Each structure stands twice: as C-alpha cells, then as structure tokens.
Design a protein around this ligand. Structure first.
Ligand SMILES: Nc1nc2c(ncn2[C@@H]2O[C@H](COP(=O)(O)OP(=O)(O)O)[C@@H](O)[C@H]2O)c(=O)[nH]1
Length: 325
C-alpha cells in the first residue's frame, strides 16, 4: 500500500471513534451538564457563577480512539474593577501564555476567600471545587431519570466526576474553573512544571479549533483528519504521549499557512510535512502558537523531554508507516 492507503486505514480502524459510541457519550455529557447546572445552583447559592458548559475534543468531534472524557467549564464571576490580570511576560516568572490575577481597590468579593497574598490562586480556586466533587457522595441520585450514576473519579483525579451509563460505559467529566477579565479568558489548568502551578493558563483552545474548523469548512480539506491521526499516534506510546492536542493542532495550523491545498489526496504529503515540521520545532525547542506567537507551546517540556521526543521521531521521515503500527 502507499502511505495514503495506510493512513486512511489507520484512521478508520484506530483513530476514528464509532459514530454510535461518539454520539451516546456526547449525549451523556449534555444530560449531566444540564443536571449539574440546576443542582449546583441550589447547592452553592453564594458562589458567583455563570452557567456551566461543556468543552473539549469530544464536543468538537476531535476526540479519537475512544470517547471517555470532556471538560465542564466553571465560569467564575469577577467584578472587573476588583481584579486585574497580569501577562506572564510582565511578571518575574516570565511565562508567556500564563497569567497572574491580582486583587484590586476596595469592595468585597465572595472570591476573596481564594486570594492569598493579594492574588487569586488558581490552585486555591481548584481546591474549592475539589471539595464540591468530594462532597458529591452526599448528593441525591442526580440524573437517575435517565439512568445515570454520578460518582467521584478514583484518586488522584480530585476534580473529576465519573458518569456510568448503559452499559459499562464511563464518561469522565473534569471541572475546569475559568476566569474572564476584559477579553482575557483564563483556566485553572496547572503549568506542567510545579514552580508555575500558581499561574492561570490563557485559554487558547477555542480559537485554535475554530480556526481549524473554518479552514476545513472553506475547502472540505483534510486538516482535521490529519490532526486526528496524529492525536491517535501520540496516544499510542508513553513517549509520544507528552505531545498535546494543542501542540499538534498548531503544527497543522502552521503548515496550513504554507500549504493551501488540503485535498483528500494530499493527505499523505501533508502528514509527512507535518512530521517534518514537528521535528524542526523540537530541534529548535520552540513551537510558537499560531494565534499567539508570543507563547511557546513547548515551554512546558524540559529540554531533555524535548530532546528525547526528537530522538523518538528521528527516522519518521524515512519510515513513517512505522508510526501506525
Ligand atoms: N476544554 C478546554 N481544555 C483546555 C483549555 N486549555 C487547556 N486545556 C487542556 O487541554 C486538554 C483538552 O484538550 P483536547 O483537545 O480535548 O485534547 P485531547 O484530550 O487529546 O482530545 C485538557 O487536558 C485540558 O485541560 C481550554 O481552554 N478548554
């Protein structure tokens, strides 16, 4: 077979999620989200929140192999005049793509409770909801009308709920606290390196995936399909598991800036170009975000982890078919 054929076979048999499993898992999330809105509205009346909503690859049809996880965004309500956010490149940590949230002026905020040293801690905010998750063993049988049973995920996933549905199906929904100041959207998703775990993370995923969708919609291209193959490959081994969806998505987006033709028959050529690009970014130890160039997406990896990834992908341009096995 030509590489083209092996790629389509790989996507079909490995990357692609069965349309049945996919939609059913999706509905489970929708069902639980709707329930969690109502119940938590009553269980946490003091907490300034917006409506919770779903987010992630499962919601965008970019999830691969199996459908088992999705994010539940928890938007905190902040008084814009009592808080300011500071871009990481302007702090002592010097981490682009990550933010401090500083308490301002006077007034009272419910969220004053999560402030330490005059800053809103993403970890302290997380601990508030780890309590809420752990406290779910006190809840009534929510969603029991549609035969769902909500249980705290097994440790250490202190922010995850586990939804079991028909039959021996499990959907893992993790709570993700989010903060909007001005037009800056931040999520409490810790920096990989622990010395940065108290910085808020700038939300880049909605813009990345929207760009991906718009580009493929315009010409029925195979950018998304190619991405899904990569995500599936990177889920195959521990080594390649240190690569993220965001990283691979931005590899694709960068290549899309150089290549306009993403016809289905160009898939194999793009897949090779994608690997070449990935190798070059690893070589340089820098993968700039396509939508926010100031942010290096490889800055959560140690230089050794980067070198080891490069070593893992060294012969991929000459033996690409090996990745699919
Ligand atoms: N839903 C969501 N996830 C984010 C965001 N920022 C970072 N992430 C993280 O990125 C991951 C989800 O991205 P996703 O596209 O689903 O990757 P996938 O799990 O490989 O399919 C999770 O680990 C999230 O914690 C964000 O703004 N929204």
């Amino acid at each position: 077979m030509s590489l083209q054929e092996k790629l389509l076979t790989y996507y079909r048999n490995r990357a692609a999620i069965p349309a049945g499993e996919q939609a059913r898992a999706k509905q489970a999330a929708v069902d639980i989200c709707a329930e969690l809105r109502s119940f938590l509205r009553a269980k946490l009346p003091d907490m300034p929140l917006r409506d919770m909503y779903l987010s992630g690859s499962l919601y965008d049809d970019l999830q691969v192999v199996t459908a088992d996880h999705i994010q539940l965004i928890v938007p905190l309500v902040l008084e814009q005049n009592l808080w300011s956010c500071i871009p990481g490149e302007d702090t002592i940590m010097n981490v682009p793509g990550f933010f401090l949230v500083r308490r301002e002026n006077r007034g009272s905020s419910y969220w004053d409770r999560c402030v330490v040293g005059g800053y809103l801690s993403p970890k302290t905010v997380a601990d508030t909801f780890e309590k809420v998750v752990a406290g779910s063993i006190n809840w009534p049988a929510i969603g029991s009308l549609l035969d769902y049973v909500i249980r705290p995920a097994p440790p250490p996933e202190a922010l995850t709920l586990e939804v079991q549905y028909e039959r021996d199906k499990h959907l893992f929904i993790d709570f993700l606290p989010s903060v909007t100041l001005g037009d800056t959207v931040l999520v409490a998703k810790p920096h990989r390196l622990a010395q940065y775990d108290n910085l808020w993370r700038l939300s880049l995923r909605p813009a990345e995936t929207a760009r991906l969708r718009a580009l493929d919609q315009a010409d029925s291209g195979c950018r998304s399909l190619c991405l899904k193959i990569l995500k599936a490959i990177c889920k195959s081994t521990p080594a390649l598991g240190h690569l993220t969806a965001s990283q691979l998505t931005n590899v694709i987006l960068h290549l899309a800036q150089e290549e306009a033709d993403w016809s289905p028959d160009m898939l194999a050529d793009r897949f090779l170009q994608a690997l070449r690009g990935l190798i070059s970014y690893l070589e340089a130890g820098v993968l700039p975000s396509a939508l926010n160039p100031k942010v290096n997406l490889f800055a959560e990896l140690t230089p050794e982890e980067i070198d080891e990834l490069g070593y893992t992908l060294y012969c991929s341009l000459s033996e690409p078919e090996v990745l699919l096995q």
